[PDB]
Amino acid sequence: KEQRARDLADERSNEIIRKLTPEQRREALNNGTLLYQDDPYAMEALRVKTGRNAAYLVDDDVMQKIKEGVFRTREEMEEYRHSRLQEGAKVYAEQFGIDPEDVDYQRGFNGDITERNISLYGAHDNFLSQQAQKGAIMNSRVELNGVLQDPDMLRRPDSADFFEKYIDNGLVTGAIPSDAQATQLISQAFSDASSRAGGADFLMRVGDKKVTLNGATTTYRELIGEEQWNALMVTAQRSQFETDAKLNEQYRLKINSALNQEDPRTAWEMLQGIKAELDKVQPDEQMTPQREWLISAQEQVQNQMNAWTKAQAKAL
Amino acid sequence: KEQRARDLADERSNEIIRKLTPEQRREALNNGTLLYQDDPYAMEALRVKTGRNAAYLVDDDVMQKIKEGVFRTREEMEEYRHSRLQEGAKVYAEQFGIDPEDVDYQRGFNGDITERNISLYGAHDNFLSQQAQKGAIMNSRVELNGVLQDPDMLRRPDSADFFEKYIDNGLVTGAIPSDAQATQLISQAFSDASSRAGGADFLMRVGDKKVTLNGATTTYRELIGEEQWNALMVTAQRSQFETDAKLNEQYRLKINSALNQEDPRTAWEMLQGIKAELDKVQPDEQMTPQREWLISAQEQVQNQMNAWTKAQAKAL
Amino acid sequence: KEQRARDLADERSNEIIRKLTPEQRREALNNGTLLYQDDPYAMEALRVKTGRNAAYLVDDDVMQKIKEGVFRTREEMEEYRHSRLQEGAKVYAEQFGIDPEDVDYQRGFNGDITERNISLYGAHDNFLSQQAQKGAIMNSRVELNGVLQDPDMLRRPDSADFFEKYIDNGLVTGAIPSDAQATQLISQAFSDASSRAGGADFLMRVGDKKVTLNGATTTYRELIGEEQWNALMVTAQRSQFETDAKLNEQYRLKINSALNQEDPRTAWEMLQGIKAELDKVQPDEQMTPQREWLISAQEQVQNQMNAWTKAQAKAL
Amino acid sequence: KEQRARDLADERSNEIIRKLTPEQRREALNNGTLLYQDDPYAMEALRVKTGRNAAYLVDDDVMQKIKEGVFRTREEMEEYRHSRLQEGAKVYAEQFGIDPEDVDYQRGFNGDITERNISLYGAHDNFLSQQAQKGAIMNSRVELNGVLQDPDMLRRPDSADFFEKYIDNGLVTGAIPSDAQATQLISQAFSDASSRAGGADFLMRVGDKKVTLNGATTTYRELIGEEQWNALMVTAQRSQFETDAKLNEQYRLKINSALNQEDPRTAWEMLQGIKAELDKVQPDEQMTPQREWLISAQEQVQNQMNAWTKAQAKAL
Amino acid sequence: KEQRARDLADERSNEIIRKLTPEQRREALNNGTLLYQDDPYAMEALRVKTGRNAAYLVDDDVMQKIKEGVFRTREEMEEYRHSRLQEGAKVYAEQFGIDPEDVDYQRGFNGDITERNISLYGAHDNFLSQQAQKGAIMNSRVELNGVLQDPDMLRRPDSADFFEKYIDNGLVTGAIPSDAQATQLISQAFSDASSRAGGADFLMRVGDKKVTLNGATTTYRELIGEEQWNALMVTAQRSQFETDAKLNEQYRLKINSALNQEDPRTAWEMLQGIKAELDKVQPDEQMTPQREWLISAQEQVQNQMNAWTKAQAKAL
Amino acid sequence: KEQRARDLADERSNEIIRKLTPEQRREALNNGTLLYQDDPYAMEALRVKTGRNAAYLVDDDVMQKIKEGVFRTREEMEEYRHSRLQEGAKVYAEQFGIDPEDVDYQRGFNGDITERNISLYGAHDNFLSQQAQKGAIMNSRVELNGVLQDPDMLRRPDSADFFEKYIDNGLVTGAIPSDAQATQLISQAFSDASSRAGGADFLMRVGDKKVTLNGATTTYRELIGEEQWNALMVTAQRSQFETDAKLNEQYRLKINSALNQEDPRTAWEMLQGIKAELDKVQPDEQMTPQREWLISAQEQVQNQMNAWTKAQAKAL
């Protein structure tokens, strides 16, 4: 009848653990006034259950602090796990009035230990891989910003060579492991060099190197779509004029001074000089809001030249 | 044949619990007119089932009030759980006409108690972690707004030092636990200091400190993307002119007064003084809608100077 | 061999229930021409199966009308459940030609009854919690619109006090249970008071009270982000000028009349009076499309004053 | 050893069903050249397996035509199910060279029949509920468009009463069952009456009735947010001027004719008459792109009156 | 002890399959130097396991080429499945050094064959249904573009009749099976006829037919929302002027020529003729960017007529 | 009693593995001071468990480096798997102080090996299929950019033929396997040829070929929607004027020079020549921002001709 006596023990344990709080049970355990203190199987089931509770509490605490990143390395999470296991076993046994040594309590508190450790290791390893991915992305930007932040070092004809060599090495050696993440790294380095001085030269020079990604081998200008390339180039050429306000003032004032000369024939030469100087800070031939400035200036200077030639007949 | 008599008991219990409402059964239990009142196993199965029902009802009530946050601490949820367990056992037993003490009713009402407590503790701990995350985010904004709300204390050269020290400490000690959430905290503090007076100085000064995030160590200007940094700086420099309307009026009226002098030579000096004063409320060199005001003013004053010099020849 | 005879009964039942429609079986049951009418175990399996079918049909009907909200309270869903159980058992037994009393049919139709009731109670309680949430959100707007709809009662200096007291009470007592939903309630009440007359005063006064949310305690202006606060204030100050068209006409016509006086010196006083009156319907100092009206008016009146002073020399 | 002989039968069946196509097996079944034709248990396992295949094929066909809606009612799906069951059993048995009557084939083809019928009924009932929801939404728009499409019947003071009575009845009786869907119905009827002639009157009149939704009772203007109400009213007042181009022409030409009179004093009266007539096609006081037309007209007529009064002094 | 000897065989098999590569095992199988070559149960377990591996490899290959569509019909997928099964069994047995005939290898390679075939048939049938849906959508556009692409056949008064008859037939017969997809077909055919010449007539004529969808029966203008209908009509009337640039030139030049006549009285007649001709290429009364052209033209011609009448007094 | 002695062994193993760290256990294993060193079953359970741990650690490492792509081919992943299995077994056994040969440790470390290999092969094959898809997409762009990048080779009348032949072949042979991905390939090749010089001719010529996709056969202009086709054509015709700024300058300056001649009669001929030349770089008749330039030019030249004809009467 051992199958029945233990079966009734489970019911008595459930009644004990429902009808009382974690406090009243301790107050009544030393007073010998529980509902089934006499039956030993009832107390045994109550102990083996009140341990599986504390095990889940400490595991939930650790898993919850793992989910949102509070453990960076792996050894720190294991250390916190061990310390919390020990301290929590002790403190929950003390709170529930149970001896933290009685074998039955541990059969529940240690019930399924390897599988719970597997679960925690899996979740924390997922988070660690995620932060290592994010850290590679954030790190390979500082390494580039060592020789790509200087607006003078950028436009040298070797910066494209350094960038291509860096992607090639970090893709072959292992510095940039994920071939899928090389796209994010490339796009981030571009958007950086896009909205920074002189970036137009660097982009127009790097747009013809060779980079391997996902089996097929192509050219950078062909990796990202052609329309995406045109938009990126337009942004990289508007950068210098939306980042260094002084240059905007200089070119607008010089366009105005050229447009406002008395003899338009010299205004043509001044506008031509302005465009010749502006081609050296916007090499690629895309249309930017500045070529439109030159368009309006040439429009107005041509109208002025027409008017001045028509009014020159009155000098006859 | 014990395997069959109890098997028929389950069928009779199911017929009893389907063919009647929670009201008619009470009216008919004291009248001795149930469908299988004679068979004891039928009544036993009906009782052990009508308890697993009330258990799920009270558990669903508590879990439903846990899902959407009504319990802030953990002790309050446990207290409500215990009170509802007791009161619900009593009231559902009374409604279904069953004795709230008969052992069979409790074998169902207490059937799987530790696992249901595990489920509730897990859900409520998930919610508690979420609200603690949100509370850390909302709290580390008030602590910053103690020495970053004053538009005069902000532009001092030590505010950047205090901000860097705060992030470093709260990231090393534990005040800001989640390395992943430090990004949200940083972005929120920036967007705060972005659209507030004097914020341009604070941003341009903090953009060169050191902050560690996700293993790699970088500079704040390099943490968020360079184009994101330029957009943030443009917003932080348009802030003062989209928050204190009086300053907008002052600069627009002074630009107009400068532009409308009779001798443009003094208008050049007035516009230069305006730009010199404006550089002290917009330090970084990004292009804002105000440098465009100065551009238009210089354009028009140069046109006026050209016209006045051309009409000066008539004084000969 | 009882394990085999019943095993063949299941196969015969499956063949019966596949090879016939719910109609032909009734026509052939009273004609004694089924495929295995002779074997009693075959008919028993066919009955215990054709009941589990109708049980699922009625349960699917009830669950489907529960999923999309057709039952508001809980007692109404239970009542509909009971009536549909009875009527559906009867009608499906009648359609399938089976006696609605034969014990075997009920062993299938009542097979797993408590678990299906658990499922329905869970789904309907989920929906009931959702509608109670939505109803609290929609209800705490009418209670506010009792003393916040009057454009005159709003701008009194006590409306902010009433709003703060209401949130505090409803957050402590229980009228507004979900601390997470207090954000939705606050944002909704604001957006209401935002786009309504006089709302600027109410917002600028409430932006310095104290509200507790998620453990940390802050000020309303700091709960929602500072840039969000500036946008909300701009909207609340453009409200009065995008809701009462008459006021727009009044201020635009008065600005025009001021700008079009013959002696600009009085136009300065008129514009100053206009701005002084306008500060009382837009207290906070944010930039709105109306301060821009005053900016353009002052620009043009200053140009006119300059022109009139320059042409005053001809009076000498 | 019956546990082993059948165990080897499963392996032989798997080898038979892998090593051959549905065609070669038929060609080789009548030639007596299968791999294990001698063993009867092998053939029995092959038959009981080759039936569970065809069962899944026909079930997948029916479930796939159910998923994307091809069965509107429920009886049509059941009819197609039955016809396909019969025809598919026959045709798949014929293709696989198996007798469509041999009991073993049916033990597999009819293996789990009630559960598969449960699955199909559940999926098809889900789809039927979805289309009934969509049909209620689409139907309660035609019923409204019977007395809300006429641009003359709409602006009568009883249309709001009819709309409120309709929502109240259909929400109490059952014509509009889902309290959650009443929001969609209300918003759809509004957006209809929004962008249609005279809709402004209907909206401004219905915005003060009583509608119950989700326990709490409010007013229509308070059901949808106040800013949403202002946007909806602006759209409903721009409707008439973005739907009947003739009226746009009429008002623009009349504004121009008023603005272009020789004596502005009569132009004031003409513009006042225009605004008085326009208030009857835009009752609520929200700002629309048309009040802005009147604003510009009054601006220009005031400038013209000022100029004409200033030039009247030359008549002295 | 048969339960233990085989139990140790599983462990030895696992050690064999972990401690070696798919290459070393073949090199060591013919050299008689495996770790447990002596024990027959070890080799048997190793064989029954190394088959379940190859089975999963070939199944994963086929399922992976099924997931992303490479098999259009069903017979092609079955053919590829069979060929790959045979060839893969042979080649994997050869690579792993196992006889491709030994019964134990097949007990693993053919282990669960019917269920894997069920899985593949289900996935491929899902994809086939998806492509049949997409193909019906793409096909019922070519059939319409046979009598709806001609800009002259479209505006005939029977095109609406053909479209309504087509939807009705294809919805009753079965050419357009999914009542849910009839919405996509209708919207696609509209958007086609929207941005194409003469489409305005076709839309304004079809907007009053009858189409049944989801139980309820409505009119096309009421199927899609009224505001959606107005937007669609505006697009369909701007189509002709955003697709055939020549017509844009013609109307703009003629508007200019009318506006620039010397006597405005004839300009009124010219503009009236232009509007009368334009009503035949934009029947419905919605406001388009072209009625605005006529509005500006009438505005300017009325101003010119006023000026010319005022200057006519000087002819007295 | 063998069922109990091993049952206690599991509890003792769990206590051992909870109460100690991976370090203390090694220090105490050689000192003979574990908690249950005496019992052999306890040590056996501890060993069989401490192996299932290391197995999961190495499997999680490999699966985590597989999830985010670090293994391109399949043989490389298998090689890394094998090397890590060996090295990890050895190193984890050494760290946990267990003999890396004792049979019990391997019964846990090799516990479920074939299923874990199945899981890894499945995940890595999913990733490999994804990268092969992306590689086909990226590769069939370089192959096209060999004869579609030259702005002169593109506008030849055979480029459309080559493109159609390429899609047809790669869809029949297998170079472009996924019929679903042919849409992505087509759209990408178009968007490439869209925003590149001369692309208008290529698009307007390819828009009438034949391509089969998803059973139904249509024309390219009908594959993508007609409104999508019009938008794509507008973009392809604005490309040349938003990519080669020199051409923008040329046409704007020539339009200005034509508009500014003294005798408008020659300006008509100049504008007509400009439009005739512009039709050869924008063949399709869609409306672009350039036809609007010609519209404004013709508008202004017609106004000028009217003014000059009206002022010609003064020459009489």
What is the DSSP track for A253-272?
Answer: HHHHHHHT-SSHHHHHHHHH
What residue type is C11 in one-letter code?
E
Both D228 and D286 in one domain: the answer is no
User: Distance (Å, rounded) from C-alpha A231 to C-alpha A287?
Assistant: 10
Domain count of the fold of chain B: 3
Is C91 touching B (CB cutoff 8 A)?
no
User: Distance (Å, rounded) from C-alpha D128 to C-alpha A315?
Assistant: 91
Contact D210, D293 (CB under 8 A): no
Q: Reduce the DSSP state of residue B249 to 3 states and report it.
A: helix
Q: Tokens 């001698």 — which residue?
A: D38
What residue type is F141 in one-letter code?
R
- Tell me the resolution in Å: 3.6
Q: Do A285 and F246 touch (CB under 8 A)?
A: yes
B-facing residues of C in 216-235 (CB < 8 A) are 216-219, 222-223, 225-227, 230
Inter-axis angle of helices A226-243 and A199-206, to 10 degrees? 160
Taking alpha carbons only, the member of E294, A213, C196 closest to residue D253 is E294
Is E14 touching F (CB cutoff 8 A)?
yes
Chain A contact set for F16 (CB, 8 A):
none
HSE, CB side, 13 Å, CA atoms: give it for residue A157: 0
Both D228 and D257 in one domain: the answer is no
Q: Do E192 and F306 touch (CB under 8 A)?
A: no
The span from the first CA to the last CA of chain D, in angstroms, equals 134
User: Distance (Å, rounded) from C-alpha F12 to C-alpha F39?
Assistant: 9
Q: Which chains touch F (3 or more CB pairs under 8 A)?
A: A, E
User: Distance (Å, rounded) from C-alpha B70 to C-alpha C189?
Assistant: 21
Q: Do B69 and C122 touch (CB under 8 A)?
A: no
Size of interface B-C (CB pairs under 8 A): 134
Both F281 and F181 in one domain: the answer is no
DSSP secondary structure code for residue C69 in this structure: T
Q: For CA atoms C155, C156, C160, C165, give the dihedral sign.
A: negative
Q: Reduce the DSSP state of residue F310 to 3 states and report it.
A: helix
Give the H or E element holding residue F217.
strand F217-219
Contact B195, B148 (CB under 8 A): no
If phi > 0 it is left, if psi is from -120 to 50 it is alpha, else beta; for residue C286 that is beta
Phi and psi torsions of E210, nearest 5°: -125, 130
Chain C contact set for B68 (CB, 8 A):
129, 133, 177-178, 180-181
Contact C199, C236 (CB under 8 A): yes
CA dihedral of residues C248, C251, C253, C259 (deg, nearest 10): -140
The experimental method, as deposited, was: cryo-EM
Which of F223, F242, F261 terminates a domain? The answer is F242
β-strand pairing of A210-212 with F210-212: unpaired
Distance from CA of D21 to the nearest CA of C (A): 27
Exposed/middle/buried for F130, CB within 10 Å: 0-12, 13-18, 19+? middle
User: Distance (Å, rounded) from C-alpha F209 to C-alpha F158?
Assistant: 12
User: Distance (Å, rounded) from C-alpha C240 to C-alpha D286?
Assistant: 10
CB neighbour list of residue F55: distance below 8 Å, 6 or more residues apart: F108, F109, F110, F111, F116
Residue F106: both structure tokens together: 């391997």
Phi and psi torsions of A217, nearest 5°: -115, 130
Q: Which of C80, C87, C126, C179 best tests the B interface by mutation, with the highest count of B CBs <10 A?
A: C179
Contact B290, B242 (CB under 8 A): no
Q: Do B131 and C180 touch (CB under 8 A)?
A: yes
Both F20 and F73 in one domain: the answer is yes
Distance from CA of D249 to the nearest CA of E (A): 6
HSE, CB side, 13 Å, CA atoms: give it for residue E89: 20
Is B279 touching A (CB cutoff 8 A)?
no
Quickly count: other Cβ atoms within 10 Å of residue C312's Cβ. 9
Buried b (16+ CB within 10 A) or exposed e, D269-296: ebbeebeeebeebbebbbbbebbebbbe
The span from the first CA to the last CA of chain B, in angstroms, equals 134
What residue type is A25 in one-letter code?
R
Is C192 touching D (CB cutoff 8 A)?
yes
Q: For CA atoms B181, B184, B188, B191, give the dihedral sign.
A: positive
What is the length of chain B?
316
Is E192 touching F (CB cutoff 8 A)?
yes
User: Distance (Å, rounded) from C-alpha E34 to C-alpha E20?
Assistant: 9
Alpha-helical runs (H) found in chain D:
2-19, 24-29, 40-67, 75-95, 103-109, 113-142, 159-172, 181-194, 199-206, 220-223, 226-243, 245-259, 264-278, 291-312
Q: Reduce the DSSP state of residue F157 to 3 states and report it.
A: coil
Q: Do A111 and F14 touch (CB under 8 A)?
A: yes
C137 in a structural domain: no
Chain A residue closest in CA terms to F51: A114
Q: Reduce the DSSP state of residue D109 to 3 states and report it.
A: helix
Q: Do E106 and D15 touch (CB under 8 A)?
A: yes
E20 in a structural domain: yes
Chain E residue closest in CA terms to D249: E295
Taking alpha carbons only, the member of F194, F196, F200, F201 closest to residue F156 is F201
User: Distance (Å, rounded) from C-alpha D67 to C-alpha F311?
Assistant: 77
D306 in a structural domain: yes
What residue type is F63 in one-letter code?
M
Distance from CA of E88 to the nearest CA of F (A): 16
Q: Which of D6, D12, D14, D238 best tests the E interface by mutation, with the highest count of E CBs <10 A?
A: D14
User: Distance (Å, rounded) from C-alpha B279 to C-alpha A246?
Assistant: 12
Both D6 and D98 in one domain: the answer is yes
Is D2 touching C (CB cutoff 8 A)?
no
Both B231 and B249 in one domain: the answer is no
Which of B183, B207, B239 terminates a domain? The answer is B239
Q: Do D298 and C15 touch (CB under 8 A)?
A: no
Nearest to B216 among A135, A196, A262 (CB): A135
Both E147 and E237 in one domain: the answer is yes
E280 in a structural domain: yes
β-strand pairing of B210-212 with E210-212: unpaired
Distance from CA of D278 to the nearest CA of C (A): 13
User: Distance (Å, rounded) from C-alpha F95 to C-alpha F24?
Assistant: 10
β-strand pairing of C217-219 with C210-212: antiparallel
Quickly count: other Cβ atoms within 10 Å of residue B138's Cβ. 19
Q: What is the DSSP string of chain E?
A: -HHHHHHHHHHHHHHHHHHS-TTHHHHHHTTT--SSSS-HHHHHHHHHHHHHHHHHHHHHHHHHHHHTT---SSHHHHHHHHHHHHHHHHHHHHHTT--TT-HHHHHHHTTTHHHHHHHHHHHHHHHHHHHHHHHHHHHHHHTGGGTSSSTTTTTSTTHHHHHHHHHHHHHHTSSS--TTHHHHHHHHHHHHHHTSTTHHHHHHHHTTSEEE-SS-EEEHHHHS-HHHHHHHHHHHHHHHHHH-HHHHHHHHHHHHHHHT-SSHHHHHHHHHHHHHHHGGG--S----TTHHHHHHHHHHHHHHHHHHHHHHGGG-
Give the H or E element holding residue A142.
helix A113-142
Taking alpha carbons only, the member of A10, F270, B272, B145 closest to residue C207 is B145
B155-163: long-range contacts, CB 8 A cutoff, minimum separation 24 = B155/B198, B155/B201, B155/B202, B157/B205, B159/B202, B159/B205, B159/B206, B160/B202, B160/B205, B160/B206, B160/B209, B161/B209, B163/B189, B163/B202, B163/B206, B163/B209
**Whole-angstrom Cα Rg for chain C:** 37
Quickly count: other Cβ atoms within 10 Å of residue A101's Cβ. 10
CA dihedral of residues A63, A67, A68, A69 (deg, nearest 10): 90
Taking alpha carbons only, the member of A250, C272, F213, A71 closest to residue B178 is A71
**Whole-angstrom Cα Rg for chain D:** 37
Chain D contact set for C58 (CB, 8 A):
none
User: Distance (Å, rounded) from C-alpha F170 to C-alpha F179?
Assistant: 10
F153 in a structural domain: yes
Chain E contact set for F181 (CB, 8 A):
68
Both D217 and D229 in one domain: the answer is yes
Give the H or E element holding residue D210.
strand D210-212
Residue F76: both structure tokens together: 């490389």
Is D280 touching E (CB cutoff 8 A)?
no
Both E50 and E72 in one domain: the answer is yes
Q: Do F121 and E195 touch (CB under 8 A)?
A: no
Chain A contact set for B118 (CB, 8 A):
52-53, 56
HSE, CB side, 13 Å, CA atoms: give it for residue E235: 16
Nearest to B214 among A134, A252, A257 (CB): A134
DSSP secondary structure code for residue C218 in this structure: E
Phi and psi torsions of F210, nearest 5°: -125, 130
User: Distance (Å, rounded) from C-alpha C219 to C-alpha C211?
Assistant: 6
Give the H or E element holding residue C210.
strand C210-212
Q: Which chains touch A (3 or more CB pairs under 8 A)?
A: B, F
Size of interface A-F (CB pairs under 8 A): 134
Size of interface A-B (CB pairs under 8 A): 134
Q: Do C303 and B256 touch (CB under 8 A)?
A: yes
Contact A195, A243 (CB under 8 A): yes
User: Distance (Å, rounded) from C-alpha F148 to C-alpha F193?
Assistant: 7
> In whole angstroms, how far apart are CA F195 and each of B44, E55, F234?
80, 49, 10
Exposed/middle/buried for A275, CB within 10 Å: 0-12, 13-18, 19+? middle
Chain A contact set for F68 (CB, 8 A):
129, 133, 177-178, 180-181
Residue D63: both structure tokens together: 């479930």
Taking alpha carbons only, the member of D151, D271, D277 closest to residue D202 is D151
Nearest to B287 among A136, A138, A248 (CB): A248
User: Distance (Å, rounded) from C-alpha A133 to C-alpha B198?
Assistant: 36
Phi and psi torsions of B210, nearest 5°: -125, 130
* CA of residue D87 relative to chain centroid, distance: 36
Q: Tokens 């396992």 — which residue?
A: D45
Which of B209, B239, B269 terminates a domain? The answer is B239
Nearest to E225 among D65, D131, D192 (CB): D192
Alpha-helical runs (H) found in chain C:
2-19, 24-29, 40-67, 75-95, 103-109, 113-142, 159-172, 181-194, 199-206, 220-223, 226-243, 245-259, 264-278, 291-312
Q: Do D285 and C72 touch (CB under 8 A)?
A: no
Taking alpha carbons only, the member of F140, F245, F253, F126 closest to residue F189 is F140
F-facing residues of A in 110-129 (CB < 8 A) are 110-111, 113-114, 117-118, 121-122, 125-126, 129
Contact D267, D261 (CB under 8 A): yes
Residue C300: both structure tokens together: 């043009």
Q: Do F125 and E53 touch (CB under 8 A)?
A: no
Size of interface D-E (CB pairs under 8 A): 134
> In whole angstroms, how far apart are CA A284 and each of A199, A202, F245?
11, 11, 9
Chain D contact set for E107 (CB, 8 A):
11, 14
Q: For CA atoms A84, A86, A90, A93, give the dihedral sign.
A: positive
F137 in a structural domain: no
Contact A286, F242 (CB under 8 A): yes
Chain breaks of chain C after residues with C–N above 2.5 Å = none
Both C212 and C311 in one domain: the answer is no
Residue B13: both structure tokens together: 């219990």
A307 in a structural domain: yes
Contact C251, C240 (CB under 8 A): no
C157-162: long-range contacts, CB 8 A cutoff, minimum separation 24 = C157/C205, C159/C202, C159/C205, C159/C206, C160/C202, C160/C205, C160/C206, C160/C209, C161/C209
Phi and psi torsions of E102, nearest 5°: -55, 125
Is A294 touching F (CB cutoff 8 A)?
yes
Both B7 and B117 in one domain: the answer is yes
Buried b (16+ CB within 10 A) or exposed e, C52-80: bbbbbbbbbbbbbbbebbbbeeeeebbeb
User: Distance (Å, rounded) from C-alpha C60 to C-alpha E136?
Assistant: 32
Enclosing domain of residue B235:
143-239
Q: For CA atoms E242, E246, E251, E253, give the dihedral sign.
A: positive
CB neighbour list of residue C306: distance below 8 Å, 6 or more residues apart: B260
Both C177 and C200 in one domain: the answer is yes
Q: Do D230 and C69 touch (CB under 8 A)?
A: no
Distance from CA of D115 to the nearest CA of C (A): 8
Contact F284, F237 (CB under 8 A): yes
* CA of residue E66 relative to chain centroid, distance: 18
Q: Do A126 and F64 touch (CB under 8 A)?
A: yes
Exposed/middle/buried for E285, CB within 10 Å: 0-12, 13-18, 19+? middle
B192 in a structural domain: yes
Contact C85, C58 (CB under 8 A): yes
User: Distance (Å, rounded) from C-alpha E123 to C-alpha E77?
Assistant: 11
Contact E216, E207 (CB under 8 A): no
Chain C contact set for B252 (CB, 8 A):
295, 298-299
β-strand pairing of B217-219 with B210-212: antiparallel
